[PDB]
Design a protein around this nucleic acid. Sequence first.
RNA 1: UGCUGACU
DNA 2: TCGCCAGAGGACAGCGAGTCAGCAA
DNA 3: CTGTCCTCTGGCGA
Lengths: 95, 57, 58, 60, 690, 110, 257
Amino acid sequence: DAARFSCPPNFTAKPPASESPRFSLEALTGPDTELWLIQAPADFAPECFNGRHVPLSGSQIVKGKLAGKRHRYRVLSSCPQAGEATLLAPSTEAG
Amino acid sequence: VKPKADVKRQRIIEESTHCGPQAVRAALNLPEAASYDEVRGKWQDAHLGKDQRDFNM
Amino acid sequence: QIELEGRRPPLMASGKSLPCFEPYEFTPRAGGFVTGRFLTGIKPPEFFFHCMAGREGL
Amino acid sequence: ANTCSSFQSDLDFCSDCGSVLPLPGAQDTVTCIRCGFNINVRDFEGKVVKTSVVFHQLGT
Amino acid sequence: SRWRNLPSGPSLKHLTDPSYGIPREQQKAALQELTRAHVESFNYAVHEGLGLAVQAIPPFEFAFKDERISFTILDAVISPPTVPKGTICKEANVYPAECRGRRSTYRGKLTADINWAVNGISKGIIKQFLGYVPIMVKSKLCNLRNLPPQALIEHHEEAEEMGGYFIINGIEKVIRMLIMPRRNFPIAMIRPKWKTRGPGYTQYGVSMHCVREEHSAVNMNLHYLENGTVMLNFIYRKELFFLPLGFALKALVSFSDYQIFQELIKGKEDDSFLRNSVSQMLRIVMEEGCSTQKQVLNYLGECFRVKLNVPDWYPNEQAAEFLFNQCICIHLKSNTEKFYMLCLMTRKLFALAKGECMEDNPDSLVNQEVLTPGQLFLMFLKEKLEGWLVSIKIAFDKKAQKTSVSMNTDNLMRIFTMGIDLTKPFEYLFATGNLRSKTGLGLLQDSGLCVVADKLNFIRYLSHFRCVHRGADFAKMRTTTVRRLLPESWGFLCPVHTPDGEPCGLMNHLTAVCEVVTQFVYTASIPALLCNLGVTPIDGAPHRSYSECYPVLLDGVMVGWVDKDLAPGIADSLRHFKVLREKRIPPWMEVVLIPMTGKPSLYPGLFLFTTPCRLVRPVQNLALGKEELIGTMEQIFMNVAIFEDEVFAGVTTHQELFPHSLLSVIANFIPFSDHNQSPRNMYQCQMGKQ
Amino acid sequence: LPSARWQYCGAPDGSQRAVLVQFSNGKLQSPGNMRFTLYENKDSTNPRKRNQRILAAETDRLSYVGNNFGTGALKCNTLCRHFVGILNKTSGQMEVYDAELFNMQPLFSD
Amino acid sequence: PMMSVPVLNTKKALKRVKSLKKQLTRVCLGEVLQKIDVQEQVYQLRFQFLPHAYYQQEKCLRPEDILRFMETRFFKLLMESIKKKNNKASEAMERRVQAVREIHPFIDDYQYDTEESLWCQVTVKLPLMKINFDMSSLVVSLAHGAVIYATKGITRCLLNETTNNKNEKELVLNTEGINLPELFKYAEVLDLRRLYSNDIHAIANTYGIEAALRVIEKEIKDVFAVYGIAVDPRHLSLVADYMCFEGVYKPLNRFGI
RNA sequence: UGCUGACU
DNA sequence: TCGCCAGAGGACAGCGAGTCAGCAA
DNA sequence: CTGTCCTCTGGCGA
């Protein structure tokens, strides 16, 4: 017998989102869709890059504006390394 | 020391400031010339070596 | 020419003999060759190398 | 799952050394698989080419 | 700055000035910065460090009759000196002018408020009077603080004095900065007398000297055994105990054996003797009986319970935590951080063993730090407070073991029964100089800790607050290699100022511009800034191969793995912050980046020290002209011109403030020292003090 | 060099988060047979507890558990932030979302 | 330790000495090797020896002798060390291979190199349970202290061409080891009278004690000479006569009393 | 008696 | 088949003279 | 620190 994870009494299972068709497995497996993992400093404001052209290879300095102050962010793009975080998505197939 | 004798001393001291590369190189038995950075690397290797008798050379 | 253990002054762990000298510097000055005399004193690095040798003696 | 030849893969700790044919189920969670691995672990390694050698060092 | 307004040529029109005898409005400020390391250390030791010391102080629970009693020390406070009790009249204060006339100690009152409980529902806060602790002269717990030179003359004082000393029986003991290995940094060492520690030990090992908040120090050694296995030696109460690694790693972290392994093979994931030796550490001694964190803690608890002297009603799992808290990596609060630090020290022994790294000389100032008067004072205070608790409750358990219900009537009569202790023990360390402690305080020396400061001259006196003693044990050694004046003490120790007989090379003196760090800062926003700069947290996704990455450390805590092409820019950015006082980088953080090549150079990685006992020295930062402060280890990877016209474009990152910065304070009083031979400047320094 | 136009469609209230998993013992050879269940704390009034989550993964042989709180919560979840970018190759537009990273670990009880 | 025998001053002796110097220097397996290639319980090993261009010049070695050495000494010291570890752990190619595996039960087959030691490997296997680690460590710590052949006690010779101005024609075969009898075979190449060594215990065993007295005296004199000091011979005579009083070279220390 | 300094 | 050539570590014992002072146990 | 002195210490043919 596998001791089956037992959920603590103060926790409840979160249902899937049927109102989420975006992170749906179907949407993510589309031939024109690519998934990217992004790591940033804790104080990084992603909105500062809105409309700006982030690189898909190499290293580039990208300028962002936050609260009126100009910030410049070095962006490094790479080939996924074996062992990287896997994205979980709701699947109708998985009940 | 007499002047006209410290001028020769000064010129010899000026000449002595150019005798390191040749000395070290011709002691590592490196190509006689054409290497100016291989010599620094060979000296570094001889310095971090374990035996340390190519450094005393 | 300063000589401590029968050898020139020792290098640091980074390859420089003294904070003033580039690492692995070829000039004899960087190895303890003092061209100054007590008539006209010896610059600050030569004073340090000379001090290592006088202390080795004591 | 992608852990090699000394761990449990599913679990976490490291298995014991081989004696009987079956993968030696660990003291915890004794599940077994791959009694004897397909290929013996082959290792490609050699020595250095400056001191031990009189070759590779004619000049340089 | 602090070296501006330095005279350009001497003058003689200051004597023969109409104001020669008028006492000045404020004290000199250049003479004050000499004993500054002795006073700013004590100021912390007695106010901000004492609270932290008492905060550790595990509550001393023990059994009375069939009852269990808990005693905790909530606060301890040292008061300025004062007339004993009120039995005296007309002036409560007590100024150091007396106790020199009389022959007595300038001692302040140390009192704490203990809190005793019976199971935690019955409690009362009593305020016991612990004893008397000596006080430094201008130390914030002294009566001569904040006095101008004119008011310092009506009390019979020097009008130019900087105390930095103690008056133990009117003798002015001058406890001097001893040399310690380092703090919170793993030093890889090749000592051949280590293979005698056991059957298969080798002459390789990384030592770490751990200090927590300046109140606790501990020394832990990771040894390499010939099998490829690593052992851990810890010392508790002067006894050496050897625990295989794996027992320690499994206890500290509830992680799988493969995850512990994936960590100790981070940079050498192709090597196969290592991969095989890591597995032998995890399986050979741990799959032999204990495979869950608790069983490891339980086994470790049973073997060590007898010599850790733990409470009898303690589960073995609780006795294990006691060992890890009090003996291994004192500096780190977390057990997860303590795991990552033991893993980097091992990853380093594997590189020293395979000859991929150079042994760190313990005798280079790169791998050395100083022990100030406040670290010795607090580290003795804390130990004596723990001893006081133990003795009061020895008396407790021994008196009657009798129905504490009504015995709450004599509880104070009980605590006072052993509160008669803390005074004389403290004066021994100061009047005699030698240390009587159950744990030697992570020190290695037990004598010559405090010395008489004699005012034969003001050049004998000023040299007691700038002396640095390599150690008192090295005065007895056949080999003379701790007497070599290496080129790494450039600007930090004077070449000329050394005693010229039996103490030669062992008693050094700081240059005029050198200084000890003594401030304590937050250093909490630094780990979050390093990540903005380009570091990737120890948790994962390095973005490269763990071999083309630098292991980032910040005061014992491994932030982790700045990429190899981002390490230079990160070091330069951090150096620009400290110089311009941006972010919260302390003006004195040492950003070190030991580069990595294929050669057996010192182990690579970006360190960042900000601890309170390192030596620093000013240098004019070129390219900014902003008077940076560099440390003993940070100075080995940078070019520092002395004279201008010696500055170059790519070379000469920095420049020195004055050309005579290298020489001590006394060696700067010798005229034309450049034209005399050096053994003569060493005798002049010793003759100007007689 | 190939580039993408950055857009943070992100989370409407920031209540929405994606879910990233990392296994402490390596890569799962067959992630297709795993069932993941995300658990959240019932206490929505306590700001400290309202963000506590447990991720459980069940296989035939073992269970994995990851949490964003307590010892199992690791430093990377805060010092750094994680995002997921969804790139439309045709439009060159990258949509960026907040992500939560769970470090997964095996399940056993005495 | 050292020696110094003059060279006999004859045309034949001068020619034979070159070979003599090249004959007494130690050649060790490690001084002749390029790099090993270890594969691993079936542990193979290819030695890949150096070409003769740059080591036969001053070592007097030949490849058949060197390889024969591996078959008879290294490949069995290897099993000796494997047992050292495993005791406390818990047409013509054919005859050579056959005799070699006649003597050991682990090896299978090596190789042959009919062209200047092209590829010379070996294969072993311990099939049941052995500690499979990077045994390259053992076969490298052993391929250093493994010496092809050396005169016992002599580590290197050298001919310091000139030692005299009066009769400049002198040649000396100095050595950095000490084996007196292993030079007695060259009484026609070298002058065995005039043989000198700084050992004083070896002289006292090959020539007697009255010959060690003078070596003691000359050693003390040459020690003082490097500093210009000069103690009178009448003092060293008494010291050497007292030290060698009772037939043996006795130390002047706590065990001599 | 010991620890700290100190002299040639 | 264990005696003696070899072979290992462990233990001990030495570490220049002679002076002057103070402080403290 | 380094040296001898000392005490074992199990290992192949006679």
